[PDB]
């Protein structure tokens, strides 16, 4: 235990502050899958335990490059070995300032220029090498190979560039299932490395390693890959594909109260479907793609530079920068992050077509910062024909000039709408903000194109309310770039549009005032509150079209609950602790 006020309960726990404010503002970052998984460079991170899979392409490789795993494990990869050939293969990276090709200040200098608010290494994958200086776990970076703390280098390289730092911990799946089809052995050593410790015993790695590492760097981050609480991801393995309970409430207690003492808000994530943390103090992390509306309470979206593996192998391809910016904007826009992963060669060098990717994040990000960090989702994430499908593993969005994503500022007084393309014609239609959507725009200040630079604004040619939507025509196309910024300065607020089909609250007996524009769905009260309109002060609700509405006093939807249909209705102030929106 560590001195806090956290005791190792859920009820303690979830008083922690899940996402803190500079994480909802930080909205890009960078980690990399680099350890001795990459060493073979083939497949995918898994290859530790693809390399044993009954009948694997991965087993055949290992067979005809280094021999048979049975004799040759992945251990030869740790500790060092000759392959069939004769070539000695080890994770040995070696700085360039002794004269070799790992060069982790171009990595970071690279990581720094794409604009990433938050970075950091894997500190440990499912392979069980700890990539710090353990003395839980004699399978670490310091003992063997490089014998470099590599996570304590990544963390001092990230804070000297003015970086939170983040670590990628996924340890939980080590013995959870991932080294199944590896030897069964004796060795107490080798048991630790492949998993087949006691249970008892394995859980209380998971949790030593998490204070070893947490306790050494004092990471912003933690990030938990698979494995905690996640019954039907570990395949057919005899095992609960969770860690244990209490070892995961003292983890929590553990890393909470050591950030008291620190005195850092931080964060730990879990995947959506893991549901060993709660949303309470964690952040759910969408692997691979994101939600399809506004996702409420805050969330993380974390993706790789390659569609096939988190880690480098021979051929690997590479996703496009437009790729990667149109995804970050539509998460942006939905109440989300972005962590981005790069895939470093063994060797430790940064490949050009990913250099060319960060540096291309890095031009938009220098230019329109403004529209993306310090800002927040606004009701209606955006308007257009490209969407994404929803959920984990799903496209990433590539956009055009007829798709819209919209971030307002704190203040909720300036509106960033951001086309994902030039118009041909020069033209940008915000359908949200016509007069069918029951706006008006009289308190509409500017509205302006950000250019080449930042703080280079050209105000808009001309622009005008229709009753389908607001037409503005845009001034000449700025220099070159994946996506174009315009900025609404309102004056007393953005104006509180109404959604053909959903509704729109306001604490106030009118429609006039702070609201919340709702579409078709659920909105807890914890998603109310988080739009900026807590449930118990709402007094007005304004229905669209057969859009019936139902209202429950839980911020769970649960219990009695009455029910409005269309047309204005105004509620007793505390009535309202849920909105349902139907039909
Ligand atoms: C491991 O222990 C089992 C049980 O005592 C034994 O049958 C097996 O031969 C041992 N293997 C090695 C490599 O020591
Ligand atoms: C989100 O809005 C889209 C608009 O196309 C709608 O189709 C979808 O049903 C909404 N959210 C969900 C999944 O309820
Ligand atoms: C944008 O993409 C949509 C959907 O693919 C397509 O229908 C539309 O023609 C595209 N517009 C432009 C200007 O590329
Ligand atoms: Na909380």
Same mark, same amino acid.
């Given at each position: 235990?560590?001195?806090?006020?956290?005791?190792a309960?859920?009820?303690?726990?979830?008083?922690?502050?899940?996402?803190?404010?500079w994480?909802?503002?930080?909205?890009?970052?960078?980690?990399?899958?680099?350890?001795?998984?990459?060493?073979?460079?083939?497949?995918?991170?898994?290859?530790?335990?693809?390399?044993?899979?009954?009948?694997?392409?991965?087993?055949?490789?290992?067979?005809?490059?280094?021999?048979?795993?049975?004799?040759?494990?992945?251990?030869?990869?740790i500790?060092?070995?000759?392959?069939?050939?004769?070539?000695?293969?080890?994770?040995?990276?070696?700085?360039?300032?002794?004269?070799?090709?790992?060069?982790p200040?171009?990595?970071?200098?690279?990581?720094?220029?794409?604009?990433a608010?938050?970075?950091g290494?894997?500190?440990?994958?499912?392979?069980?090498?700890?990539?710090?200086?353990?003395k839980?776990?004699?399978?670490?970076?310091?003992?063997?190979?490089?014998?470099?703390?590599?996570?304590?280098?990544?963390?001092?390289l990230?804070?000297?560039?003015?970086?939170?730092?983040?670590v990628?911990?996924?340890?939980?799946?080590?013995?959870?299932?991932?080294?199944?089809?590896?030897?069964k052995?004796?060795?107490?050593?080798?048991?630790?490395?492949?998993?087949?410790?006691?249970?008892?015993?394995?859980?209380?790695?998971?949790?030593?390693?998490?204070?070893?590492?947490?306790?050494?760097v004092?990471?912003?981050?933690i990030?938990?890959?698979?494995?905690?609480?996640?019954?039907?991801?570990?395949?057919?393995?005899?095992?609960?594909?969770?860690?244990?309970?209490?070892?995961?409430?003292?983890?929590?207690?553990?890393?909470?109260?050591?950030?008291?003492?620190?005195?850092?808000?931080?964060?730990?994530?879990?995947?959506?479907?893991?549901?060993?943390?709660?949303?309470?103090?964690?952040?759910?992390?969408?692997?691979?793609?994101?939600?399809?509306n506004?996702?409420?309470?805050?969330?993380?979206?974390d993706?790789?530079?390659?569609?096939?593996?988190?880690?480098?192998?021979?051929?690997?391809?590479?996703?496009?920068?437009?790729?990667?910016?149109?995804?970050?904007?539509?998460?942006?826009?939905?109440?989300?992050?972005?962590?981005?992963?790069?895939?470093?060669?063994?060797?430790?060098?940064?490949?050009?077509?990913?250099?060319?990717?960060?540096?291309?994040?890095?031009?938009?990000?220098?230019?329109?910062?403004?529209?993306?960090?310090?800002?927040?989702?606004?009701?209606?994430?955006?308007e257009?024909?490209?969407?994404?499908?929803?959920?984990?593993?799903?496209?990433?969005?590539?956009?055009?000039?007829?798709?819209?994503?919209?971030?307002?500022?704190?203040?909720?007084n300036?509106?960033?709408?951001?086309?994902?393309?030039?118009?041909?014609?020069?033209? &940008? =239609?915000?359908?949200?903000?016509?007069? *069918? +959507? $029951?706006?008006?725009?009289?308190?509409? !200040?500017?509205? @302006?194109? %950000?250019?080449?630079?930042?703080?280079?604004?050209?105000? &808009? =040619?001309?622009?005008?309310?229709?009753? *389908? +939507? $607001?037409?503005?025509?845009?001034?000449? !196309?700025?220099? @070159?770039? %994946?996506?174009?910024?315009?900025?609404?300065?309102?004056?007393?607020?953005?104006?509180?549009?109404?959604?053909?089909?959903?509704?729109?609250?306001?604490?106030?007996?009118?429609?006039?005032?702070?609201?919340?524009?709702?579409?078709?769905?659920?909105?807890?009260?914890?998603?109310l509150?988080?739009?900026?309109?807590?449930?118990?002060?709402?007094?007005?609700?304004?229905?669209?079209?057969?859009?019936?509405?139902?209202?429950?006093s839980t911020g769970?939807?649960?219990?009695?609950?009455?029910?409005?249909?269309?047309g204005?209705?105004?509620?007793?102030?505390?009535?309202?602790?849920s909105?349902?929106?139907?039909?």
């Amino acid at each position: 235990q560590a001195s806090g006020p956290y005791e190792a309960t859920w009820e303690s726990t979830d008083k922690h502050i899940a996402s803190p404010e500079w994480f909802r503002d930080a909205k890009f970052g960078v980690y990399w899958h680099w350890g001795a998984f990459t060493t073979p460079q083939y497949a995918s991170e898994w290859y530790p335990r693809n390399m044993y899979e009954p009948g694997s392409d991965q087993r055949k490789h290992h067979t005809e490059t280094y021999g048979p795993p049975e004799e040759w494990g992945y251990a030869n990869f740790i500790n060092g070995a000759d392959d069939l050939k004769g070539n000695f293969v080890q994770f040995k990276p070696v700085l360039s300032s002794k004269g070799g090709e790992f060069d982790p200040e171009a990595i970071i200098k690279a990581v720094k220029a794409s604009g990433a608010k938050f970075a950091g290494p894997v500190g440990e994958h499912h392979d069980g090498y700890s990539m710090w200086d353990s003395k839980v776990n004699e399978w670490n970076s310091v003992k063997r190979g490089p014998k470099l703390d590599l996570v304590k280098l990544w963390a001092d390289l990230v804070r000297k560039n003015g970086m939170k730092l983040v670590v990628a911990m996924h340890q939980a799946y080590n013995y959870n299932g991932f080294y199944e089809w590896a030897p069964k052995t004796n060795d107490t050593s080798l048991k630790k490395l492949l998993g087949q410790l006691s249970r008892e015993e394995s859980d209380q790695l998971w949790f030593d390693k998490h204070r070893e590492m947490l306790d050494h760097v004092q990471p912003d981050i933690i990030w938990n890959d698979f494995s905690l609480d996640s019954p039907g991801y570990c395949a057919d393995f005899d095992g609960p594909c969770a860690v244990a309970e209490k070892k995961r409430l003292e983890f929590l207690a553990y890393y909470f109260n050591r950030a008291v003492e620190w005195n850092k808000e931080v964060v730990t994530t879990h995947k959506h479907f893991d549901v060993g943390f709660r949303d309470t103090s964690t952040v759910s992390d969408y692997e691979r793609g994101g939600p399809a509306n506004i996702t409420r309470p805050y969330w993380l979206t974390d993706d790789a530079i390659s569609a096939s593996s988190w880690s480098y192998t021979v051929g690997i391809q590479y996703y496009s920068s437009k790729a990667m910016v149109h995804s970050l904007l539509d998460r942006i826009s939905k109440n989300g992050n972005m962590l981005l992963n790069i895939s470093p060669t063994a060797v430790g060098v940064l490949p050009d077509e990913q250099l060319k990717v960060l540096q291309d994040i890095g031009d938009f990000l220098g230019r329109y910062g403004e529209s993306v960090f310090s800002t927040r989702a606004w009701d209606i994430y955006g308007e257009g024909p490209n969407q994404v499908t929803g959920g984990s593993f799903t496209a990433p969005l590539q956009g055009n000039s007829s798709d819209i994503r919209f971030t307002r500022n704190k203040d909720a007084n300036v509106l960033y709408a951001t086309v994902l393309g030039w118009p041909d014609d020069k033209h &940008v =239609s915000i359908a949200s903000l016509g007069s *069918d +959507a $029951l706006v008006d725009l009289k308190s509409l !200040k500017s509205i @302006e194109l %950000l250019g080449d630079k930042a703080g280079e604004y050209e105000q &808009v =040619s001309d622009w005008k309310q229709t009753k *389908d +939507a $607001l037409e503005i025509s845009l001034p000449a !196309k700025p220099a @070159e770039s %994946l996506a174009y910024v315009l900025k609404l300065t309102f004056d007393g607020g953005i104006p509180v549009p109404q959604p053909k089909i959903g509704a729109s609250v306001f604490s106030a007996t009118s429609a006039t005032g702070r609201g919340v524009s709702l579409g078709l769905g659920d909105f807890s009260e914890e998603f109310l509150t988080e739009a900026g309109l807590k449930p118990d002060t709402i007094r007005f609700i304004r229905v669209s079209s057969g859009t019936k509405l139902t209202v429950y006093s839980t911020g769970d939807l649960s219990g009695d609950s009455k029910e409005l249909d269309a047309g204005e209705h105004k509620v007793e102030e505390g009535s309202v602790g849920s909105i349902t929106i139907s039909k």
